[PDB]
Amino acid sequence: KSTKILILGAGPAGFSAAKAALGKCDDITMINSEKYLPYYRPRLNEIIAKNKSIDDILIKKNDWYEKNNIKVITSEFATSIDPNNKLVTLKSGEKIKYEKLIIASGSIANKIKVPHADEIFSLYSYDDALKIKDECKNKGKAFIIGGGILGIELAQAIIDSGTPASIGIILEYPLERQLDRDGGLFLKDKLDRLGIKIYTNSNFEEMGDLIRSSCVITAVGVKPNLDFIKDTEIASKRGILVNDHMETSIKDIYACGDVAEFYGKNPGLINIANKQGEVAGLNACGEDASYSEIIPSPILKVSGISIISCGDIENNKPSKVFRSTQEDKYIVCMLKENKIDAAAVIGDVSLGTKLKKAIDSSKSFDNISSLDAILNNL
Ligand SMILES: Cc1cc2nc3c(=O)[nH]c(=O)nc-3n(C[C@H](O)[C@H](O)[C@H](O)COP(=O)(O)OP(=O)(O)OC[C@H]3O[C@@H](n4cnc5c(N)ncnc54)[C@H](O)[C@@H]3O)c2cc1C
Q1: What intrachain disulfides are recorded?
Q2: Which letter does DSSP use for residue 12 in this model?
Q3: Which residue, by CA, sits nearest to atom 34 of ligand 1?
Q4: Cα distance between residue 42 and residue 306, in whole Å
Q5: Where are the domains of the chain?
Q6: What is the Cα–Cα distance from 162 to 156, expressed in whole angstroms?
Q7: Distance (Å, rounded) from C-alpha 27 to C-alpha 69?
């Protein structure tokens, strides 16, 4: 088999490339390791929370790919790329020739060892969600290891489905990449009075009884899924390195979405997948579109508590810090001279957005004597 445009991976990024290539190129093939068409992966929590199926989260149904003549090979996994012969080798041993290759292979969950746990689950795929659904009914409760957004959202989804759940983290407070200590503890409190318990400073060896009796899910982050490039000269660091055209180190090979690293950024967000996938498809069909960095992200969809975080909060060495704790909201604002370098707000997206804009536009503040004076100049 041989095609014009070969798309390696059929998630949101791959889908967006196919859609972009439509009308412009007339021979498009998508390879996907899963047995499902491209689906809106961030809604996996709804499979758990609302008992929705794959059909409810698919981006396009079968008929769309047929009407548009896009060929999807499901349950097939690329293992090798031969760039000079333009051949991709699959798990079966079958080879596919391409004129252009778009790598859209997304991410893979970080795997950690958890003491006392026979089976460790993580939530990446639709099949993952189902496995979690069933163990939660089987065990009767869940224990989520990992201090991030996804771990918290999953806990609520599992609560919503009708199963108790709590979280275990190794640090003192959750969300340490997005929040300072006081921010995280503010969040922990709000989550704890909402029935989402977080075990802090955990030693999992000492949590045998809970671990044993729970469905254990690790939510410890994700990395670009790119082992199949190992023998090639395709440049990578964390992700596959791409320019603004989504072109890799190697001619006629592109990458986009979760697998791709653009000016050192690999944020792992769906709007980036959609937009990078689009640019890749367009370029693969000979239209020299440029991706520009977009990215805001209002987190998180959890327990009706909203968070926006901007800049390097975790390791910030600011000249000045302004903090506000209220009943409904938490604000932290970190200065570098007369500029806001980093900020996070819990419970006021309107304010977080103003701080975001100030940071992004690099607004200078001639008055830094008080938080009030900064707020008035946003
Ligand atoms: C539970 C969960 C919640 C999320 N919530 C949010 C959110 O709120 N906001 C947000 O912005 N993002 C969220 N995300 C992330 C979002 O889903 C991703 O950014 C987006 O799916 C990336 O799309 P992608 O096409 O680059 O990668 P993927 O969605 O991972 O798709 C890549 C596809 O390629 C396949 N593949 C991998 N290797 C091969 C290979 N060797 N050969 C052939 N096929 C291969 C994979 O099976 C996969 O189907 C969430 C993710 C998860 C898992």
Answers
A1: 25-285, 136-215
A2: H
A3: 9
A4: 17
A5: 1-110+221-295, 111-220, 296-378
A6: 10
A7: 8
* CATH superfamily of domain region 1-110+221-295: FAD/NAD(P)-binding domain (3.50.50.60)
CA 35–ligand 1 middle distance (angstroms): 14
Q: Distance between CA atoms of 260 and 240, rounded to whole angstroms?
A: 5
CA distance readout (Å), 113 to 108, 148, 188, 235: 16, 18, 25, 30
Cα separation, 232 vs 266, in Å, equals 21
Q: Residue 90 in contact with residue 205, Cβ under 8 Å?
A: no
At position 35, the amino acid (one-letter code) is K
E strand or H helix at 331:
strand 330-336
- Say which CATH architecture domain 111-220 belongs to: 3-Layer(bba) Sandwich (3.50)
CA pair distance 143, 116, nearest whole angstrom: 12
Nearest to 81 by CA among 106, 101, 99: 101
Binding residues for FAD: 32-34, 41, 78, 124, 258
The experimental method is X-ray
Q: Which residues line ligand 1 (CB under 6 A)?
A: 8-14, 31-34, 41-42, 44, 77-78, 104-107, 123-124, 150, 225, 228, 257-259, 268-270, 273
Sheet holding 87-90, edge to edge: 78-82, 87-90, 95-97
